[PDB]
Design goal:
Helix content: under 10%
Family: Belongs to the OspA lipoprotein family.
Number of domains: 2
Number of helices: 1
Number of strands: 21
Strand order of the largest sheet: 10-11-12-13-14-15-16
Structural class: mainly beta
Radius of gyration: 24 Å
Strand content: over 45%
Order of helices and strands: EEEEEEEEEEEEEEEEEEEEEH
Function: Induces host (human and mouse) cytokine release by monocyte cell lines via TLR2 and CD14; nonlipidated protein does not stimulate host cells.
Distance between the termini: 56 Å
Keywords: Cell outer membrane, Lipoprotein, Membrane, Palmitate, Plasmid, Signal
Membrane topology: Lipid-anchor
InterPro entries: OM_lipoprot_Borrelia (IPR001809), OM_lipoprot_dom_sf (IPR023322)
CATH topology of the largest domain: Outer Surface Protein A, domain 3
Length: 239
């Protein structure tokens, strides 16, 4: 048994009269025949409520602590890809549904964008043979990121589709700190550690990545260029 609380947008939340053994309160609300539940540290009707729609999308309602604003978010079934957000406060509401864009190349690899907004921002994924790179769209520039230890590899794709790659490492020790130089003519990132070249990463015209090590001198390539087949092999190369 609960108490009904008036929310922005003429919506209602039911908050239990008293708390459970943890001192938390149960929340129940009904949005578009879909009924949501949650628990909260407050007894006034604020907190987070969650539910699942008929199309498997994940719904999350956030009621602000002073009850002055509600945020209704719909995610894809992964529970992280934002499809829409409706914010209500001060008698008005703003409902925003992200744009989407999929570029499919001749080899079947893809660039996928979701959450596209008029400010030029979005979420991005590159779907490759064997792995996926994740990142963001910002000012129409795509940046896909792989992190390993203190190293961040960023694959950048311009609005026009020009690919460039950079590496940053926050490592304080130069026994171990990675730096890298991009050669746009060869589409090659050369990694250096402690004044020796260690690896060439080639971003090929086939939308693959190859890795080739340098010799003990740090001057000449040895062995063969090996094609990356999974995300962990990219991380291995950044170690």
């Amino acid at each position: 048994n609960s108490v009904s609380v008036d929310l922005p947008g003429s919506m209602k939340v039911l908050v239990s009269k008293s708390s459970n053994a943890d001192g938390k309160y149960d929340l129940i609300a009904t949005v578009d025949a879909l009924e949501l539940s949650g628990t909260s540290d407050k007894n006034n009707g604020s907190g987070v409520l969650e539910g699942v729609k008929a199309d498997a999308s994940k719904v999350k309602l956030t009621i602000s602590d002073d009850l002055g604003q509600t945020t209704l978010e719909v995610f894809k079934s992964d529970g992280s890809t934002l499809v829409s957000k409706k914010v209500t406060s001060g008698g008005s509401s703003t409902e925003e549904k992200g744009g989407e864009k999929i570029i499919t190349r001749a080899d079947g690899t893809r660039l996928e964008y979701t959450g596209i907004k008029s400010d030029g921002s979005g979420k991005a994924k590159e779907v490759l043979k064997g792995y996926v790179l994740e990142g963001t769209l910002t000012a129409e520039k795509t940046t896909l990121v792989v992190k390993e230890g203190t190293v961040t590899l960023s694959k950048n794709i311009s609005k026009s589709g020009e690919v460039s790659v950079e590496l940053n490492d926050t490592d304080s020790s130069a026994a171990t700190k990675k730096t890298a130089a991009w050669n746009s003519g060869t589409s090659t990132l050369t990694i250096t550690v402690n004044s020796k070249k260690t690896k060439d990463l080639v971003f090929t015209s086939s939308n693959t990545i190859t890795v080739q090590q340098y010799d003990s001198n740090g001057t000449s390539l040895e062995g063969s260029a090996v094609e990356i087949t999974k995300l962990d092999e990219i991380k291995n190369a950044l170690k």
